[PDB]
């Protein structure tokens, strides 16, 4: 077990977990929680970054002295990947974008880069590989994002057969693009919903649940070559979910139905921004698509985690969206939304 990588201590900041993890995509939403959980117990964390170093500063306090190491990498350069995974026993891939840039399309970030990461990790002798996919990944999906996800998980399993593939469904959290995305739709007066959101079922999952699931899958020896689906405990209609979101934010909810073609036109219009788009056609397609039900796959409870319901954690995300008049309203004041749970 390589004596220097034998666990020591009480499992705290100054302890040694025995994990040496390279976390691709650590500067995003899920990455900060994963890095924080790794650094809590005394893991050595390697952060490959392509962004400005100022944009990694918030990850520095997450580990004890010497436990978080930052290195530049290029997604199109296999030598950078080899450099950042040379000394790791765990490689986590959290690289992803919800829009296409002029330099990276969905195939680049969801197929080519995961395949290169998996192949280089297999060459370098990395023992454990965690790859994140989507619950609704489908080769015949109307979303090219999900087609790329399905192709990429196929290639990751081809290049690293002992990989653990984790398929979450619409993670919600403080820095999420789900609860904040629906709460930022009020700036346009009404809320456009295809079919009034009455033909869409969502099963969102808490961010901390996903991060702890990744940690536990690392610590689980049986999780070696399995495929997990990380979903929340409740299923909601899109209409009811968005109405609940607006109730928690204490904003007036004015839903109106917009046809698929007009919503696609709006998404393409917003797609022309050189900055981070407010929405895209792919985002429009994914928002109005029902979450798949996959009972045959193991879930969070197979890793020892009871899924956190949305009703206990919606306020920690949506309190920021309230006016001054409603900031102090307590959590149990909103009367949770109806659930279609089989």
């Amino acid at each position: 077990l390589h004596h220097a990588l034998i666990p020591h201590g009480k499992g705290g900041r100054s302890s040694v977990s025995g994990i040496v993890a390279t976390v691709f995509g650590a500067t995003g939403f899920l990455g900060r929680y994963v890095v924080n959980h790794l650094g809590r117990m005394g893991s050595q964390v390697i952060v490959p970054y392509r962004c400005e170093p100022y944009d990694t500063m918030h990850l520095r306090p997450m580990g004890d002295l010497g436990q978080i190491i930052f290195m530049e990498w290029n997604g199109k350069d296999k030598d950078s990947i080899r450099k950042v995974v040379e000394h790791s026993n765990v490689v986590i891939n959290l690289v992803g974008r919800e829009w296409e840039t002029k330099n990276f399309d969905f195939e680049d970030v969801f197929v080519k880069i995961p395949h290169a990461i998996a192949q280089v990790s297999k060459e370098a002798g990395v023992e454990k590989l965690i790859h994140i996919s989507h619950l609704n990944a489908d080769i015949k999906s109307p979303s090219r994002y999900l087609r790329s996800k399905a192709v990429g998980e196929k290639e990751v399993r081809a290049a690293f057969p002992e990989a653990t593939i984790i398929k979450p469904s619409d993670i919600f959290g403080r820095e999420d693009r789900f609860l904040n995305y629906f709460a930022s739709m009020r700036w346009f007066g009404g809320v456009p919903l295809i079919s009034l959101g009455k033909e869409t079922v969502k099963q969102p999952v808490y961010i901390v649940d996903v991060s702890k699931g990744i940690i536990n899958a690392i610590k689980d020896p049986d999780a070696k070559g399995k495929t997990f689906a990380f979903v929340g405990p409740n299923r909601y209609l899109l209409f009811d979910l968005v109405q609940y979101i607006f109730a928690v934010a204490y904003r007036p909810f004015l839903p109106y139905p917009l046809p698929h073609f007009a919503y696609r036109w709006v998404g393409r219009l917003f797609e022309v921004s050189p900055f981070e788009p407010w929405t895209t056609r792919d985002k429009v397609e994914r928002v109005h698509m029902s979450d798949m039900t996959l009972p045959h796959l193991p879930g969070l409870e197979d890793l020892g985690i009871q899924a956190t319901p949305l009703e206990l954690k919606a306020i920690e995300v949506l309190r920021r969206h309230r006016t001054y008049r409603w900031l102090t309203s307590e959590m149990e004041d909103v009367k949770p939304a109806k659930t279609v749970n089989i």
Binding site: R13, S14, S211
Partner: protein, 208 residues
């Protein structure tokens, strides 16, 4: 015994001894012992019940006039049945003199607050309660003064560890400062310094 050795003052020693005898004669109900050190410092050891009557006397008597309370602190001696030694240091400007008043208490016995004698005592008593856990009866506003809000324990006790039990850090999952059990990258290195040869024969104790 010339330049290196600190000089003695017999005049002050005699004056302090006489005044200690005076105080002991006036208040036999509470005074248990009187001592004068060789560097001319007077100590009066009293029963706890006499904290207020003695201090008041030393403040108000025409021949004492100890109007200033310089300091008030506690000393922890775990081997004693009464753990905590309570020390009052008083200054008389009229007679240009200093005096020390000593008493004792344990963990569960209150000591009368002396804010009615010296207002300066207020914060001092708070500090004692904060650092040693000694409760002062009839204190106007007794609460922690030096430690963090919600802090548990009394750090200045001898059995309280130097680094305590909890440490603080910023956690990003909850977006706040959190307290967790203390873990040290380097443990404080205990040193055994005492020489096994006796230094001062004048303080040798009987061998029991």
């Amino acid at each position: 015994t010339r330049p290196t050795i600190r000089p003695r003052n017999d005049v002050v020693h005699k004056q302090l001894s006489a005044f200690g005898q005076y105080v002991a004669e006036i208040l036999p109900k509470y005074v248990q012992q009187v001592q004068v050190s060789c560097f001319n410092e007077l100590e009066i050891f009293i029963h706890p019940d006499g904290v207020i009557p003695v201090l008041t006397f030393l403040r108000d008597h025409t021949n004492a006039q100890f109007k200033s309370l310089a300091d008030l602190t506690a000393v922890d001696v775990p081997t004693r049945q009464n753990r905590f030694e309570i020390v009052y240091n008083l200054l008389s400007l009229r007679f240009n003199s200093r005096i020390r008043v000593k008493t004792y208490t344990d963990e569960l016995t209150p000591i009368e607050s002396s804010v009615t004698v010296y207002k300066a005592a207020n914060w001092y008593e708070r500090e004692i309660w904060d650092m040693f856990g000694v409760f002062f009866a009839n204190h106007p506003d007794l609460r922690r003064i030096l430690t963090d809000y919600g802090f548990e324990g009394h750090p200045f006790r001898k059995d309280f560890p130097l680094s305590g039990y909890v440490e603080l850090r910023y956690d990003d999952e909850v977006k706040r400062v959190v307290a967790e059990p203390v873990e040290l990258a380097q443990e404080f290195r205990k040193f055994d310094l005492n020489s096994p040869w006796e230094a001062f024969p004048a303080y040798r104790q009987p061998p029991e």
